[PDB]
Amino acid sequence: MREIVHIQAGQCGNQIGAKFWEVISDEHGIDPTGSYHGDSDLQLERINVYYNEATGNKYVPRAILVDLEPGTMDSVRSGPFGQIFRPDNFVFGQSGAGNNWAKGHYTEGAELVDSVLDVVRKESESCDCLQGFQLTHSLGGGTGSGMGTLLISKIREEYPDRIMNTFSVMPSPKVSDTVVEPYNATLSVHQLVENTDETYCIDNEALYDICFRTLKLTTPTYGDLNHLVSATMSGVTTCLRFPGQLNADLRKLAVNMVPFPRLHFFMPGFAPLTSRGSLTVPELTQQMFDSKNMMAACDPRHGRYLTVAAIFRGRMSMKEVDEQMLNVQNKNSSYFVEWIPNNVKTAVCDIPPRGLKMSATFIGNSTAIQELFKRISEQFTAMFRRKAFLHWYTGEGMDEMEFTEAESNMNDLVSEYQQYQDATAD
Amino acid sequence: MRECISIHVGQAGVQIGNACWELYCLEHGIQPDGQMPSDKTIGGGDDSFNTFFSETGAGKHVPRAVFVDLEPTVIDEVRTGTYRQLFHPEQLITGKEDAANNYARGHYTIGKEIIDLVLDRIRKLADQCTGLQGFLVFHSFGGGTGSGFTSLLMERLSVDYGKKSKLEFSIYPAPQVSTAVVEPYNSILTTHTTLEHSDCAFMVDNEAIYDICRRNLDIERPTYTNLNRLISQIVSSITASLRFDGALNVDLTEFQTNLVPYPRIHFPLATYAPVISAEKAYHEQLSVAEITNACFEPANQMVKCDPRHGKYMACCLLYRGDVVPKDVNAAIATIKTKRSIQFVDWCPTGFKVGINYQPPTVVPGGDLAKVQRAVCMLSNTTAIAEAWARLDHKFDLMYAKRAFVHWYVGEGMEEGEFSEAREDMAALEKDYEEVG
Amino acid sequence: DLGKKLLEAARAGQDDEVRILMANGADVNATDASGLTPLHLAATYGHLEIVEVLLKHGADVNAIDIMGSTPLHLAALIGHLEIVEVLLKHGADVNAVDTWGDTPLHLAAIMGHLEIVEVLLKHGADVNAQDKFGKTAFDISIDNGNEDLAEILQK
Ligand SMILES: Nc1nc2c(ncn2[C@@H]2O[C@H](COP(=O)(O)OP(=O)(O)OP(=O)(O)O)[C@@H](O)[C@H]2O)c(=O)[nH]1
Ligand SMILES: Nc1nc2c(ncn2[C@@H]2O[C@H](COP(=O)(O)OP(=O)(O)OP(=O)(O)O)[C@@H](O)[C@H]2O)c(=O)[nH]1
Ligand SMILES: CCc1cc(/N=N\c2ccc(C)c(O)c2)cc(CC)c1OC
Ligand SMILES: [Ca+2]
Numbered sequence A: 001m002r003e004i005v006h007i008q009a010g011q012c013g014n015q016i017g018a019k020f021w022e023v024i025s026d027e028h029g030i031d032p033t034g035s036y037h038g039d040s041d042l043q044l045e046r047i048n049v050y051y052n053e054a055t056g057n058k059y060v061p062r063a064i065l066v067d068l069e070p071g072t073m074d075s076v077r078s079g080p081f082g083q084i085f086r087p088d089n090f091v092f093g094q095s096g097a098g099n100n101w102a103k104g105h106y107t108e109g110a111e112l113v114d115s116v117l118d119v120v121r122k123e124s125e126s127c128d129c130l131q132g133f134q135l136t137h138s139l140g141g142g143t144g145s146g147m148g149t150l151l152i153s154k155i156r157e158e159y160p161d162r163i164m165n166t167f168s169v170m171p172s173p174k175v176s177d178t179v180v181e182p183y184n185a186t187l188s189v190h191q192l193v194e195n196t197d198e199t200y201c202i203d204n205e206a207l208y209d210i211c212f213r214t215l216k217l218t219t220p221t222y223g224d225l226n227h228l229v230s231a232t233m234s235g236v237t238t239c240l241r242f243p244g245q246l247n248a249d250l251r252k253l254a255v256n257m258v259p260f261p262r263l264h265f266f267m268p269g270f271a272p273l274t275s276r277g278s279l280t281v282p283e284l285t286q287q288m289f290d291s292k293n294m295m296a297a298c299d300p301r302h303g304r305y306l307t308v309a310a311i312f313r314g315r316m317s318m319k320e321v322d323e324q325m326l327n328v329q330n331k332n333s334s335y336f337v338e339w340i341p342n343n344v345k346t347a348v349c350d351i352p353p354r355g356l357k358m359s360a361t362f363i364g365n366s367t368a369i370q371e372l373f374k375r376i377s378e379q380f381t382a383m384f385r386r387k388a389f390l391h392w393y394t395g396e397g398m399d400e401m402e403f404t405e406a407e408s409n410m411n412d413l414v415s416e417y418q419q420y421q422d423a424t425a426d
Numbered sequence B: 001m002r003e004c005i006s007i008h009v010g011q012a013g014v015q016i017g018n019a020c021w022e023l024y025c026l027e028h029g030i031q032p033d034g035q036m037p038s039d040k041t042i043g044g045g046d047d048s049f050n051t052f053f054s055e056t057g058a059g060k061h062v063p064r065a066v067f068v069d070l071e072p073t074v075i076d077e078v079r080t081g082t083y084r085q086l087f088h089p090e091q092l093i094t095g096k097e098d099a100a101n102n103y104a105r106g107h108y109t110i111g112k113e114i115i116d117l118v119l120d121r122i123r124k125l126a127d128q129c130t131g132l133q134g135f136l137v138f139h140s141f142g143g144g145t146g147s148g149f150t151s152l153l154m155e156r157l158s159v160d161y162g163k164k165s166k167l168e169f170s171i172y173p174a175p176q177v178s179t180a181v182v183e184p185y186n187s188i189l190t191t192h193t194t195l196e197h198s199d200c201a202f203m204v205d206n207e208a209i210y211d212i213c214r215r216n217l218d219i220e221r222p223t224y225t226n227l228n229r230l231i232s233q234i235v236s237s238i239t240a241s242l243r244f245d246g247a248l249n250v251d252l253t254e255f256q257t258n259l260v261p262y263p264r265i266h267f268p269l270a271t272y273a274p275v276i277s278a279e280k281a282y283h284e285q286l287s288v289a290e291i292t293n294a295c296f297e298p299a300n301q302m303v304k305c306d307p308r309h310g311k312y313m314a315c316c317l318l319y320r321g322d323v324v325p326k327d328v329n330a331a332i333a334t335i336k337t338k339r340s341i342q343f344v345d346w347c348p349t350g351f352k353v354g355i356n357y358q359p360p361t362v363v364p365g366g367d368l369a370k371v372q373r374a375v376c377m378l379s380n381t382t383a384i385a386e387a388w389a390r391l392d393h394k395f396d397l398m399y400a401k402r403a404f405v406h407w408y409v410g411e412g413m414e415e416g417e418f419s420e421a422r423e424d425m426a427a428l429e430k431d432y433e434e435v436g
Numbered sequence C: 001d002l003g004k005k006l007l008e009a010a011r012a013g014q015d016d017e018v019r020i021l022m023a024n025g026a027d028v029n030a031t032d033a034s035g036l037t038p039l040h041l042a043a044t045y046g047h048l049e050i051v052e053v054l055l056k057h058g059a060d061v062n063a064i065d066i067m068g069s070t071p072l073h074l075a076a077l078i079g080h081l082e083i084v085e086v087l088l089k090h091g092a093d094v095n096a097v098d099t100w101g102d103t104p105l106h107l108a109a110i111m112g113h114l115e116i117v118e119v120l121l122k123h124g125a126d127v128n129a130q131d132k133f134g135k136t137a138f139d140i141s142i143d144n145g146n147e148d149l150a151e152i153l154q155k
């Protein structure tokens, strides 16, 4: 368990993927040219997880960049760390998917997928012990959604014993008011249930609400939303990248977080929430569990926690952490399933992220995430009942029954969450 | 002399093994490079410490020890640490991919990739022995390697060494220091599959060691190093009879004779006293009676349980230091007039006593004060069943919902082995209730 | 038969071809197999000019397909605000109910078309209208935690 191969697909996937690499590069001392420029050897012990070390002592992201639209390309390279990526790892088509899952999964994307896997093979063969894969993408579009799930399928076929991990951005009318996004998202969730081991649900509805209502940003931009995504992505990968008491890896996270194969959709949270330019251990702890701090638009107090992983970053009393985490478990013991004993695990890292001296990251497998899938299901159903814009999909070869199967599978997922929400030890 | 081979499996096994062999070397006067001046027989010998150390011709004394892990991080520290020159380099064995807290990976899939190399390296050590008595196996219950690979290893050792004794030092999980939610599963799985292949197993409850470090040693948040140094002092007290002269537990077979009346109920409870903080170097030196009485206080136990709710079937007291036999006998006489100490009606009610007159050793960097006399009591009490019950209950809560079971079924294990292991634990508990 | 051609021209946004077909006598209120009219299809695909021309030449603003969907239902679902306003000015039934019990307000609420929600309310949308599962537009807002929508619905 060492190398993670990173894939970013579509506009959203490449956008939040680029910000991810900017953040962890800073945390690890890698500058935009690939040279190390830090002041601590802890920044380098586990650097091989995300970086290939080239000749010249130059560190290069093990990152593959994919999009059916060439436009996203020039945007990445012109970015701050745009030149740090392996130029050969850009695999970009000519015609976008037009927000059409079917074009991404079956036509445009299928023509380009073989070229993408050629690059995944190369990266994978250059690993000592490949942990698995980490994909960033949105579910509301056509490339990240349609071709992203196609890529997940092919990769699971070639590397069946490796962990598949995704950061999946869910659509919201509050951000992109394009009405086919529930189609694209339901068709993808259908794919993620079967082919991923762990999925971080990053909800644009939650990201907007945080910026708008909590941070008082009157008109959130994608940069505002992505500032919260990059912080969440850095927090949840901290223990893969920094050496701690635990030799954490993707499989150990999946084994202890996923009690049932299909329920692998995690609700991430982060404290403190901050704007792009701007705290005690008990404050950190209560905020971490606060619904206001969740990156999925669901209330955890409307469900039950199956498993929880917390990550504290900064210089702070580990014992104070231990006593706050125990406190939150006993006062609110009704929200943690009693049939999974000791289902909350804590880790503390000494290195905090940029701009903050103390921070806490939350990763919950809560039954409350069914509120997210229900919201998408209701929008899917409202559109599907009136058959709006379906020829765009069947015109690319899909069957109407592919829509009913996806909707049926997503509603089954909801029912499974509700089943374990009401289950008792008795 | 008759050789003993120690085997350390997984992180907990390896790290505790480091602490133990550090202590052993100090106790025997061996330097981190293997040199031992007090040895006059250079090139080999039949001294009592030769049970645990082979001897090269250059004065090098080499542990009869093997360290195994499915990931290299932990063992890599042994290879680059103070004792990088002490052990057989080929007896530090690492894979590249660990068991991911999954018994099935450690036993069926990942573990199968390295098992034959481990056995061939063990046979190498065994071949340098003139009279191998058996093996001491160190491992955690909750880890995927400690649980699954240990069970696979013990199975293969039984077939390849049918006549040799096998002793276990097993780390029983505690939520305070726990790493995985599935540790109850792994603990019951390894216990079921190892029961028939182990002759005597000393469980170490991490919670009990945790509490001792906090209460006795005034350590706010104990680390693994704190726990392991305290555990090593208890292991050393249990294995001292094998490495020194003495009349009690002089070989592995006698451990069963004195502590294990029946094969399946082979889980003795260890109690150690006195545990005193090194910051109190000018403590009142406790008498034999005082340290003997402390072995019946639950606070000094290595497994959390109430021996007053149970019955004793065997009791062995192992003293170290300035201990006069007559004072031991007087202290035992007192104990026998305590009605909280109840023996079963079919065992000799007496106590077995060994005394090593060398004062206990404390490691530099340790948290224990040096003392003039210490004692480790090894008893087989039905109260240890309470620790199995705690594990069985956590197991039952999760298995009732089949939580996490797919992780095991997907790594080469049948779902029925869960119920088979749980029923075996059910039978073990009735075994204890019947003697009680 | 110019009916099918007008249905396709309205769906595709071919304004000039819509004018021609109505000059040659095309049925402005022609229906496809599911009961959708040219006005339904133009309102779904956002063709305002075709919506206005159809309404000025005898289109039934409140025509229903086999599922009870009116043009306003679809414009509110897809989120075509100006078409919503034009349909209302020409007499669209703001509280039309389809076979699922849904009103235009239900659909704009589900899809998060907040400006259209406001317009429908200003024109007498029934906040107490229940769908087949008993939910009003406000229940949908409360159930999905859409605080912005719930605020609008409580004006
Ligand atoms: N948080 C966040 N969401 C984004 C970003 N860019 C796009 N999205 C969301 O992603 C969804 C649309 O998918 P895209 O990624 O833009 O589309 P695509 O994957 O490139 O495929 P095409 O539509 O064919 O271009 C909508 O829900 C957007 O709100 C971004 O930078 N940050
Ligand atoms: N006393 C003590 N317990 C430890 C130590 N290291 C780990 N543990 C305990 O062992 C259990 C975890 O098992 P490990 O030994 O760490 O795992 P492993 O054997 O390497 O197997 P993997 O799953 O492959 O990592 C937990 O209950 C830990 O608290 C240690 O150094 N001392
Ligand atoms: C980098 C991935 C990662 C892996 C971990 N491995 N094991 C865990 C996880 C959860 C629980 C409930 C458990 O018992 C063990 C733990 C953490 C944080 C504690 C982690 O960071 C998100
Ligand atoms: Ca000698």
Ligand SMILES: [Mg+2]
Residues within 6 Å of the ligand: A010, A011, A012, A069, A096, A141
């Ligand atoms: Mg795009």
Ligand SMILES: [Mg+2]
Residues within 6 Å of the ligand: B010, B011, B071, B098, B143, B145
């Ligand atoms: Mg390990």
